[model samples]
Target: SRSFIAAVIAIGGMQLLATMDSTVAIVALPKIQNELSLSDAGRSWVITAYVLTFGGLMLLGGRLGDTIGRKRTFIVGVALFTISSVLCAVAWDEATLVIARLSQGVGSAIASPTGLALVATTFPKGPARNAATAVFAAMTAIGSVMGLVVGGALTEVSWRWAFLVNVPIGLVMIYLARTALRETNKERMKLDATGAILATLACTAAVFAFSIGPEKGWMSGITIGSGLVALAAAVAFVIVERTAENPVVPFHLFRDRNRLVTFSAILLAGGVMFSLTVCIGLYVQDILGYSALRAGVGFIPFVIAMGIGLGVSSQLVSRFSPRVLTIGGGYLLFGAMLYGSFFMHRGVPYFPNLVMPIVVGGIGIGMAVVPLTLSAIAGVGFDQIGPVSAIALMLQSLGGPLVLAVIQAVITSRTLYLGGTTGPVKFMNDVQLAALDHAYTYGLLWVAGAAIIVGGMALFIGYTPQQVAHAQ
Candidate 1:
């Protein structure tokens, strides 16, 4: 009983730490930007840097866990994450903070898959494992919400505290993991260096292209070069994976139709979710003139709605099937984005206008996440689960900033054109500010479009109970 309890705590702690970085910097972005004198593009990097590294290297990290021992990988990840947090807290400039965030992501990549695998290995393959899985899933959902709240609170006090909070938690997790958790000594496996390097480079380049292209102009030589690099690296990765003695991501995972559909759906879902969160933050701070703390607190409705949706979906999955849940969830997200797109204005009331959309979107996310995760991993063999999960997460990571950048680019171009300001203008005056607000309204439309696309993807992922059975 004690060992099981310890295992759950260790695994859950790792997941919490891994995910906290996702949103913990959101509310603090304003403070960080002001202190560091960062440009808009640089501010975006604070987020993109982490996602790129974590998403890119996750599969390799998972493979490493399988090759060595899960416990060792877990401990190493914790240590790296802890040290990176300290660096983030103490960083004096934008470049340092971005680099620290990137390192934090690398640590998260090492921790996440191994932590999940630890859950599977620790619990027996029946109700216990199911319960553990539920708890693990809940950690991810809850952690996202907690990050917003905690980030807001810490940012209110001082942004550095947000990073500092992780130090004690990481230290405690490391101690508990080493003393209580048993190591899973899996057999030695070949490392797929070529596949890993190519995949990481491809993903990093793609994210760079997306995040930078909007500011630099799509036709800019830099942007074009990044795009070409991404395309080439992706092609190379695919070829290596197909021919490698040990592929980091096996091509066979995509052969399962349900898994393929689920992966696509989740990718779109993640993009929409991420884009909405970023846009809403901008709306609250830039448009509605809310303090960082207030904006973070305003997200309470979304968090509560997401919790309710997650609870409801977990119960409904056995009865209704993953297809129904996914479709229903996507529609909810679409409706929520549509509602926000229509109603969001410069002086709108916070409660009914803003809160309602967030709640609706949160519920949609809750319903979509579990089923999508289940479907993506369904029918995946035990050996492949690590890589498949990594790939699935990578797509999700890519979608968020990719969609956000595209929407931002569209909005910026339209707004600037409407303002009749052409050549490399600096800060907008009052009239231009109004145009910027109008541009954001159109951006919300883009968000709605993305949500609609994800909903369609969900519809494409029909029911397949047999997939899970096969996986078992």
Candidate 2:
């Protein structure tokens, strides 16, 4: 009982901080930008800096967890994150905030995968792990949803408090983690610094290319060359991993076809989650003429719907299969996005149009995450959980910023076509909304397509209830 609560706080609380920052700043971006006197593109760096480092260094973080100690690494990460949060709150300019955010991402890169590995090591498989995993999943949902409402509320007071609030919460989690978590002895494995560096470099180059491509024309020689270099680095990373004594990623871990599919689905699902949170946050406040606070509160229903979906998924996974439940999630997500697309016109009311679609999509998140999260590492062993879980989170981290870049490209291009350039407050009225409307609906189609496309891939998973039950 004691361990369970501690694991929940350490692991679940990590989930809260990991994703909550991604969107908590979305509503407050205007305040952050205006106060700090940042350029439009400079403002984008607030989120971009975090994503690039987090996605890039995840593999290195995973290896550190395996070599040092999972619990030890987790505490280090939490401490780094908490201290960085304090620094972020006190940031006086654009550069200071961006640097602080980048540090926060590194802390997250260290904390998140190891947190999942802790769940794997702490609990036995079957009902206990599943239930605990569900709570972890729910925290992710809570984190994302709370970021909206919480960001708005904090911003209402002062954007500085949004970062400051993490100070006490992180401190408590760190204390609980030290006392409750069992320390693992260091594993006798060779450290693969070459592979780790190569992997981190490859991901950094790739994400940087994607992040900057829209701002600089995609066809620009620099963008094209960056992509080529990234691909080459990736190939080199794979080669190094295969031969390394203790590979950054154990290629053997990907032997299961079902596991691979789960990772693929997560890739797509992640994109939808990040894009929806930010784009929708902006659309409501920008187009629908809602204030930041109301838009944040508007997402409360999305959290409720996700909770309902999680409940249904918990019931279904025990009887049916994660395959069945995940398929249901994908279906719900597709339909929800489609519904949202239909209501994207300017005249549509918030209650039926925006609220209904978001709620439906939230339900999809619930249904999909349980099966997806559990199944990805279903047959994994404790010895390998750190690397395995990191790989999962790595894919998830890559998906959001990569996909958002493409979607933002469309948004930027379309908005510019309609309104010439983003302009003053009064200048951004009706036509701008229409431009954003078209761009958002277009992006929704891509998300819907991704859900159905990868969702169906789960058909190959074909694992019965028995396999999942016995995985631990």
Candidate 3:
């Protein structure tokens, strides 16, 4: 019983670092780019390398857990993640940083899903599972919030500190996990090498397509080929899963109606959460000329609001239906995004504009994220935990990049239009800054639309209050 709780804590730490690092890098990107002398493309690669590899290999990692034992897989993952942190911290050039980031993604791809799945295996069913999930969800919000604070402080000293900070966290998680994590009875299944290869190639191609298309134009051969390859690989993956003995992704898992809606909610959450983090950080630093430390400090209220919402939601998740939380949280985000879109501008007041908008949105996310996570894997079987967790996170990981791709494309085109209309400029930075604010404003509306749709997906989720009351 003692180790059980400790295991959950270690798993939660893994979850915290994976989510935190993403936001930390978001806040630290400008500094990293400047220090490393990276072009926009190179800077983009820094983020992509981590997320792309994570999205690509996540399913296979989950399968590895089921095949090799979760504790073993988790130990290797934490070890890899820890070593990569050192590499990222010591990186002297763009190539080294990118490679390190890619390695970090591989580690995260293994750790995150297995960690979450282990929670289910360790805790008893019913209230225990629900409670653990609430804790996990709360950690998610807190990690992102902490990331901003940590990013700001570290960037003040050196951007390398942001990556360096993870070293201790990883080592701690690794040690605790090794000592505390109790693996479920290991299930030996045939690994789906075909599906793994195809899925990895598909995600890689898709990321390449979206990124290259925006930069080189949609008609670029590389873009076109990427798209074609992604489509073909995706189709092949579908076909491979049909015949593969023990597929990495068992599409049959989608049979649960509630799981589908949960995926939808996570998809939207990915876009909203990631886009908000990046845009707000950029707006404060680039447009308003806030120091990195100042910008990071500015997010304190946002973090507080989210923590409050998470606290409230954790209490309510077992009492009310997930649908209730979903619809309510969805509408809250919808309104918040619209409000930010309309009012966020350069030189905007910090009180109502920056503070209120972020606080309100964070609260909304806090409410939705908890219930959404609980409902997503409510009735998942012990054997299926890893695969189920993997699929759930994969949606979020993929959605963040895809949705951001659209927003980035919008931001670029809108900026070009604004600049062109102004008849060119001597100081492109000033002009582009204004355009950036306008572009983000326009893009936030798209995010608003997604938020509300996420809320409306409650219609498809079939869980009842009674069912949620005893979810395993």
Candidate 4:
């Protein structure tokens, strides 16, 4: 019981910190920018710096966990993240904060995937692991939602507290982690330097391209070239992985069609989760004129609904096939987003228009996540858990940016056509506001489409309920 509690705190704490940091500073960005006298571009980088490094280094982080031992890698990551959080809080200038944010990303990149793997190793197979995995999934949902609310609350006191808040929590996690988490047997094989380099470059380049695509013209040579380089590196990585004795991404992992489909479901579901939340967040703020704190508080219902869904799905997982749960959840998500796409508008009231749809979508996300998270790692070998977990999470990380970029492009085009400046909506007329609102609704359609696809792909997932329960 002690060890289980410790493992939960360590693993769940890392998930919370990692996801929290992703959005925690978002609401406080204006405060961070003004206090530190950051340029507009520099302000954006405060967030982008973390995202780029976190996305880029995830696979390498997984490899490190496999090679050095998961507990060690996880502790090291927590230390780095904790230290960087302090540095961000104390930052005197733009460079200091940006560098600190980048370091935080590195910490998260290392800890996140390994944390998931640690769940597999720390808990016994079947019900224990399933429950642990459910907790892991729940922490992810809690962290993402809390980030906004915490950011708003902390910023009210001082934006610095947003970063400093991690100090005590991280310290406690580190202590508990060292004491309670069991160390896995490490492989003393040669590191796949080529694959690692290629993977990092590919992910980094692709994230960079997407992050800037909305700001820069999507058709611009810079964005296009960056995308090409990412693809090139990815191809090279695949070729190298095929021959490497210790490949970063084990090809055999994908040999199971069920596993492959589960991974695809994770990716699409991730994109839907991401895009739906973001579109609503922006809509409430930009169109409905909600304050930052109000917008953050508004998401509380989403969090509560998601928790309910998670509780129900985790209970049903042992008896029901993942195919049933995933399909059911996906349809709920589809219907919610489709409703938002049609009925959510400039003047639509928040009570039913925003709250009702978000709650349904939240429950949908919660239901799908448990089955997908458990299924992805179910029956996976202990030694290969790190890389398998990495791929699953890496796909989730990549999906958000990739889908959101497309949505942004859609918004920009429609806004410009309506004679609205693509720069800022501070002084936009009603026509321009309407155009922006229409564009967001259109973007939600894409999220709905992705959700339906998540449900559809479950048709190929052939894992029986017993298979999941007997996972190694």
Best by lDDT: 4
Q: Estimate each model's TM-score.
A: 0.84, 0.90, 0.88, 0.91
Query: What is the C-alpha RMSD, rounded to one decimal, of candidate 4?
Result: 2.6
Q: Which RMSD values do the candidates have, in order?
A: 3.8, 2.9, 3.2, 2.6
User: Over 4 Å off in model 1, which ranges?
Assistant: 1-9, 12-15, 26-52, 91-99, 116-134, 156-159, 175-181, 205-233, 413-438, 466-472
lDDT of each: 0.75, 0.79, 0.77, 0.82
**Candidate 2: tens digits of C-alpha lDDT, residues 67-115:** 7788888999989988898999888877788899899989988888888
Report the lDDT tens digits of candidate 3 across residue range 327-349: 77777777777888887788767
Ranking by TM-score: 4, 2, 3, 1
Candidates 1 and 2, the one with greater TM-score: 2
Ten consecutive residues with minimal summed lDDT in candidate 1?
Answer: 463-472
> How would you encode candidate 4's per-residue C-alpha lDDT over 265-366 as one tens digit per residue?
778777766776687778888988987678778888888998899888988898998888888877787888788777777766778788887889879878
- Put down candidate 1 lDDT per residue, 401-438, tens digits, no spaces: 66877887888797877783433324556677677777
Which ten-residue region of model 2 has the weakest summed lDDT? 420-429
